[PDB]
Design an enzyme around this catalytic site. Sequence first.
Site, PDB file in Angstrom:
ATOM      1  N   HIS A  58      70.721  23.326  -2.507  1.00 22.82           N
ATOM      2  CA  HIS A  58      71.934  23.860  -1.898  1.00 22.82           C
ATOM      3  C   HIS A  58      73.006  24.198  -2.926  1.00 22.82           C
ATOM      4  O   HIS A  58      74.157  24.435  -2.546  1.00 22.82           O
ATOM      5  CB  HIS A  58      72.482  22.890  -0.844  1.00 22.82           C
ATOM      6  CG  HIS A  58      72.966  21.583  -1.393  1.00 22.82           C
ATOM      7  ND1 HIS A  58      74.085  21.472  -2.188  1.00 22.82           N
ATOM      8  CD2 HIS A  58      72.485  20.325  -1.245  1.00 22.82           C
ATOM      9  CE1 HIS A  58      74.271  20.205  -2.513  1.00 22.82           C
ATOM     10  NE2 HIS A  58      73.313  19.488  -1.954  1.00 22.82           N
ATOM     11  N   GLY A 118      81.167  16.889  -4.996  1.00 25.10           N
ATOM     12  CA  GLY A 118      80.566  17.094  -6.293  1.00 25.10           C
ATOM     13  C   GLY A 118      79.574  16.031  -6.708  1.00 25.10           C
ATOM     14  O   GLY A 118      78.992  16.138  -7.795  1.00 25.10           O
ATOM     15  N   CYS A 129      76.730  15.485  -5.348  1.00 19.94           N
ATOM     16  CA  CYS A 129      75.369  15.939  -5.108  1.00 19.94           C
ATOM     17  C   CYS A 129      74.621  16.104  -6.424  1.00 19.94           C
ATOM     18  O   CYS A 129      75.161  16.623  -7.405  1.00 19.94           O
ATOM     19  CB  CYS A 129      75.388  17.253  -4.330  1.00 19.94           C
ATOM     20  SG  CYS A 129      76.055  17.089  -2.660  1.00 19.94           S
TER      21      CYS A 129
HETATM   22 AU   LIG Z   1      77.910  17.944  -3.799  1.00 20.82          AU
END
Ligand SMILES: [Au+]
EC number: 3.4.19.12
Lengths: 301, 301
Positions: free
Chosen positions: A41, A143, A145
């Site tokens: 993603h 952030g 991820c």
């Molecule tokens: Au993220």
Amino acid sequence: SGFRKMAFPSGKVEGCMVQVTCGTTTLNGLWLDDVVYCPRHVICTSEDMLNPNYEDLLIRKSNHNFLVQAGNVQLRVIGHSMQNCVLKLKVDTANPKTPKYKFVRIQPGQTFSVLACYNGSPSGVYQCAMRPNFTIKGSFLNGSCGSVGFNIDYDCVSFCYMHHMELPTGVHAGTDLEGNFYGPFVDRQTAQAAGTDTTITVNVLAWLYAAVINGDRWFLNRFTTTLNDFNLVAMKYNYEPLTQDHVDILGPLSAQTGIAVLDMCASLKELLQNGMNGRTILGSALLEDEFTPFDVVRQCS
Amino acid sequence: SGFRKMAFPSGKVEGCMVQVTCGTTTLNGLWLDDVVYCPRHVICTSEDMLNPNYEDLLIRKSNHNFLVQAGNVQLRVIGHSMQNCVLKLKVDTANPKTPKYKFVRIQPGQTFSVLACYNGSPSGVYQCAMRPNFTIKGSFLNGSCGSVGFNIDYDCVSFCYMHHMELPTGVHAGTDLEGNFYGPFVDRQTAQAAGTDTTITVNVLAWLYAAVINGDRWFLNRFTTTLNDFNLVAMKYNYEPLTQDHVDILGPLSAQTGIAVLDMCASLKELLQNGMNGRTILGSALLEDEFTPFDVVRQCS
Ligand SMILES: [Au+]
Ligand SMILES: [Au+]
Ligand SMILES: [Au+]
Ligand SMILES: [Au+]
């Protein structure tokens, strides 16, 4: 002596944390050998997460559209593919800080240490466990991820988790390092909900075994019970059915403490039925279920 | 979102963990530049700890009597001195993994991350706070002496703790990196006891502020109070007197949440007076006091 929520030393994994940018989105990547792993993603916009056709979005992306950064050294991408819900960015230079590692899909109830990351830089480290409904109760801001969960077996680093989602209920969901989500979660911003979170019964027993070796013994009673009759009480309080395998894994703890696992289940039965009267066990006012039977022998040895 | 007990990434400190042996005793050392730091009770035997005249025991020790090992590389000692309750072993080769660091003596109530070590090898990492009675509630087995507590300010590593003792009451005591014990503890096996452990009131408030930003708001009431009147209730429940400095440090949290610090003290007042009714806050069934006001803004930002 002493017992504390412990996490593995994160130094081996800090050498694998890079920053991946695709267009306007930035997240963290995992740099092992000449491949960089990150959530797919990253190729999405905020509007895209509403309903993203990931394959079509990847049609538009080339190798130069992926900016992998490892501090003040830029990595050159020479290949990209989509394995389930991660992106395998092939780079031309191998990571010199690559440790000994495998990719492992852990079972529900197991634990792992998480290295929270932002822009590829490590922020902190904390211990986490995979709930029976395949979520985790962690600390993940924007952030985060691409942050990973791992286990360290002497020399090997068993990577098992990569963060992807924060569900609207506050918990987090993610995939293994092969891209498969833990549970029935998709990498899409929708109305997803985990099941009824139950308690890892075998983990509560190991925690109670750790309490005996430290001095906390008030919860020891003079009762015993049967595996079936304890499962009726466990099922009432949304606890995981205790199996014979769980009994065997608690063997070393049962032998070292001299307390049969069925006597321990009787003490846990009364804690579930009488509460705690305002007392604590190992500094906690509730029953902790995020220590595996191996986590207890790891700290007590 | 999410809030979890977090520890700094330990990788910078793992490169400084060596093993020091003196005669028959083995413990951990801290290797920064061309000096190795370790507790001075490495020159002691088990009988010596009953009542050790440390200077006389050091008269008998030479440079070759100190075996510093960093994995499969042996360090050559070319100088040794005793600074308070640590030993400064001067070696001929500087640590290549030395980070940016200072030696800091933290204040009571402050937190730091601990890297548990045995035979110079890291075992785990966990978050710890210096109790008002200058003890810590940690996890320290045999051979854990020499393990360090530290803070990481971006690049700098602020070493603040070195483990020495486990008191007969179960808690641990240690020194700063200059050798001075935290509290009235000596490195001798005797009958030592810390004072009445009080609760870091300013830390409980910051934890309650973190709960508001995450969704836990049931403890918010419709009362206010005065700093003096809250200190009467705090003193009753063995809490640290809240000062005006504590009020200012909670400023950013008070402004971001819109809840004045005196309204927060009123909610905490009722929790101390009414308990928790069986509820939890941020997954804990008691009041957590091991998050500084800076620890909360560190995770929420
Ligand atoms: Au993220
Ligand atoms: Au391996
Ligand atoms: Au020790
Ligand atoms: Au510095």
